Design a protein around this ligand. Sequence first.
Ligand SMILES: *[C@@H](c1ccc(OCC(N)=O)c(OC)c1)[C@H]1C(=O)c2ccccc2N1C(C)=O
Length: 81
Amino acid sequence: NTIRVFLPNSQRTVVNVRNGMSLHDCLMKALKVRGLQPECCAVYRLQEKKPIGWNTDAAWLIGEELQVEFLDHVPLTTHNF
Ligand SMILES: *[C@@H](c1ccc(OCC(N)=O)c(OC)c1)[C@H]1C(=O)c2ccccc2N1C(C)=O
């Protein structure tokens, strides 16, 4: 049960989905092997780009195309403690 995921810089990957798996868990490895972390990105369902969260249950998205974008490079609030 595969989902098509478009990535930044014209890249693209297919990921496998099991029931209950979150989007984060479904995409973690496919992003890691391309040098990307979900925490640095936003994800969308193509339907237009509709934003969805990283805790979306990916089983409901089988059959759709998703898109991953980098978050804009703006400073984060300090969290060192
Ligand atoms: C990726 C990363 C990039 C940008 C982030 O947020 C930008 C924003 N204002 O929302 C982000 O949030 C977690 C992550 C990578 C970084 O480039 C980076 C900078 C600072 C802190 C953490 C990170 N990054 C992570 C989480 O790997």
